[PDB]
Amino acid sequence: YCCGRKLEFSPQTLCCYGKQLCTIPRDATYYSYQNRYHFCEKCFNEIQGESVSLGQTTINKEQFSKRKNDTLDPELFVECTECGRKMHQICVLHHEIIWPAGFVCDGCLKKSARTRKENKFSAKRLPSTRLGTFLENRVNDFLRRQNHPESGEVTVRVVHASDKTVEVKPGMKARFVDSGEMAESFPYRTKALFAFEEIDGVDLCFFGMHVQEYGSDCPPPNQRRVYISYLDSVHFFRPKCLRTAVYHEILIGYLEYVKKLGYTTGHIWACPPSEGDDYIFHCHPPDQKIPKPKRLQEWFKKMLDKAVSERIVHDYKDIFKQATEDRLTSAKELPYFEGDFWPNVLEESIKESGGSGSQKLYATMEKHKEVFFVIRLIAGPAANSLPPIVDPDPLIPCDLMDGRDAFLTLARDKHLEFSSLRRAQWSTMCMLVELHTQSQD
Ligand SMILES: COc1ccc(C2(C(=O)N3CCC[C@@H]3C(=O)Nc3cccc4[nH]ncc34)CCCC2)cc1
Ligand SMILES: [Zn+2]
Ligand SMILES: [Zn+2]
Ligand SMILES: [Zn+2]
């Protein structure tokens, strides 16, 4: 081999199909049918009977194969078209679409005074936006002030933007929508953006984020609000000593930008994802740990405190204090975001109380206050006389980046891990190719 290392891809984590939020981890015993419907051992033996509803066809348990999630797929090699030398495709970052003529190794390149043809499928050449330019300018200006020899050029690209609506769930709908007290749905625009760092002339995707933006056309209570759906990272930014600062620069810049457009309030649900290796990026580095809730909360506070000192954020409060200042009385006054905690808990509260949308509201808000940040961007008289929000950036149709599920599925299907610098660089290269090609159609 090339680098003298025997390399294989790790067994991934699978869903178990007989419980929402159930997964089959690596090396665990499980049952599968047609390599499509997998069941963890516990969920399988708990099914009363030997019949399993799937899809809705009923399948017998003897048709299932008993397996352990221990399959190690070896890494692929590519062969130099001149040396015959076999090298890991990931080590040399050879992509057939980028260099269709074939793989020529570095040694054969030097022995002809030759360089690889320019990678036109780069992060920088992804279409720009006013938002992405604003963010990457902030990050790169910050990095240049640090004068650290290891920092590379950072690219920020918005890769998806589409119109969506969040639907009020049945319990809140029956309580408040059917009475005409609350809009049935709330229109918003979702945006997905990613940050890339050039390391040794090679792109590395190290940050990703999806947001929901509710414009001046949105009925209350969601008007002029932005909400972070999810944020994720791969911890290989160089230098490490500027990693946290760069994340904060992106988030503060996003808040600064939406404030300029006229959004008044930002919302953050500071809740770590469940333990696992996939959130936005597939197969995180094993030594990158998910922060515990208190540390994640302090991390967001540190970011927002800097935003306050920069006069970008006027102030921020937890949901409980914010409700108290706003003199809230009913759950219909709480902003209603897609996939957020509050729509789910309000369904429970109405059911538990026998049909009230106010009973446990303040107690529930106090119980979870430290997890929910309400960020005031525009305050005072200015927040009441604002012009309509007009976004100069166009819609970006990209089904791979409409939500986080599609990109995870592509990475799983093509072994695109972010578990090491070399694999993350390869997964970044493949991800950029997909983004450049899907758009060309
Ligand atoms: C205080 O410590 C912190 C605070 C914030 C972060 C950020 C960050 O990446 N995260 C906040 C929670 C989600 C994501 C994260 O840690 N994801 C994962 C890491 C490892 C394995 C994983 N599996 N699944 C997801 C996942 C970094 C930028 C955005 C916030 C990281 C550490
Ligand atoms: Zn190698
Ligand atoms: Zn299960
Ligand atoms: Zn060669």
Annotated binding site for acetyl-CoA: 231-233, 243-244, 290, 295, 299
Q: What share of the chain is helix, strand, coil (3-state, %, to 5)?
A: 35, 25, 45
User: Which residues does residue 154 pair with via DSSP β-bridges, in sequence order?
Assistant: 197
What CATH number does the domain containing 29 carry? 2.10.110.40
CA distance 368 to 342: 10
Summary count for the chain: helices (H), strands (E): 12, 18
Q: Which of 228, 232, 288 to mutate to test the pocket of ligand 1 (most atoms within 8 A of CB)?
A: 232
Buried b (16+ CB within 10 A) or exposed e, 396-422: bebebbbbbeebbebbbeebbbbbbbb
From the CA of 289, how far away is ligand 1's center (Å)? 7
C-beta 299 within 6 A of ligand 1: yes
Reading the block at residue 28, the tokens are: 């665990």
The answer for 123, left when phi > 0, alpha when psi is -120 to 50, beta otherwise, is alpha
Name the one residue in this structure whose structure tokens are 């540390």.
295
C-beta 231 within 6 A of ligand 1: yes
Residues with CB in 5 Å of ion ligand 3? 16, 19, 22, 40, 43
Q: DSSP label at 117?
A: P
Please list, in sequence order, all residues whose beta carbon lies within 8 angstroms of the beta carbon of residue 65, skipping any fewer than 6 positions away.
Answer: 31, 32, 33
C-beta 247 within 6 A of ligand 1: yes
Q: Is the dihedral of CA 25, 28, 32, 38 positive or negative?
A: negative
Which own/partner contact pairs does 320-327 have at CB distance under 8 Å and 24+ positions apart?
Answer: 320/362, 320/365, 320/366, 320/369, 321/369, 322/374, 323/361, 323/362, 323/365
CA distance 246 to 140: 9
**What ligand is nearest to the CA atom of residue 208?**
1
CA distance 404 to 396: 15
Which own/partner contact pairs does 216-223 have at CB distance under 8 Å and 24+ positions apart?
Answer: 216/262, 216/386, 216/388, 216/389, 217/187, 217/388, 218/186, 218/187, 218/188, 219/183, 219/186, 221/332, 221/333, 221/334, 221/335, 221/336, 222/186, 222/188, 222/335, 222/336, 222/337
- Domain extent for 63: 8-69
Dihedral pair phi/psi, residue 301, rounded to 5°: -60, -40
Q: How was this entry determined? A: X-ray
| Residues composing the chain | 441
Q: Measured at the alpha carbon of residue 95, what is the angle toward residues 94 and 99, in degrees to the nearest 5?
A: 90
Quote the longest CA-to-CA distance of the chain: 79
Reading the block at residue 297, the tokens are: 């909360």
Please list, in sequence order, all residues whose beta carbon lies within 8 angstroms of the beta carbon of residue 357, skipping any fewer than 6 positions away.
Answer: 172, 175, 176, 330, 331, 332, 346, 349, 350
**What ligand is nearest to the CA atom of residue 246?**
1
Output the 3-class SS for 209-226: EEEEEECCCCCCCCCCEE
Give one DSSP letter per residue of 380-403, joined into a string: GGGGGSPPPP---SPPB--GGGSS
CA distance 152 to 146: 12
Q: Which resolution in angstroms does this entry have?
A: 2.0
CA distance 129 to 189: 15
Ligand 1 atom 26 nearest Cα = 290
C-beta 282 within 6 A of ligand 1: no
Task: Say which amino acid occupies 126.
Answer: L
User: Which residues does residue 346 pair with via DSSP β-bridges, in sequence order?
Assistant: none
From the CA of 101, how far away is ligand 1's center (Å)? 39
Which own/partner contact pairs does 91-100 have at CB distance under 8 Å and 24+ positions apart?
Answer: 91/2, 91/3, 91/422, 92/2, 93/202, 93/425, 93/426, 93/429, 95/121, 95/429, 95/430, 95/433, 97/121, 97/433, 97/437, 98/429, 98/433
Task: Say which amino acid occupies 8.
Answer: E
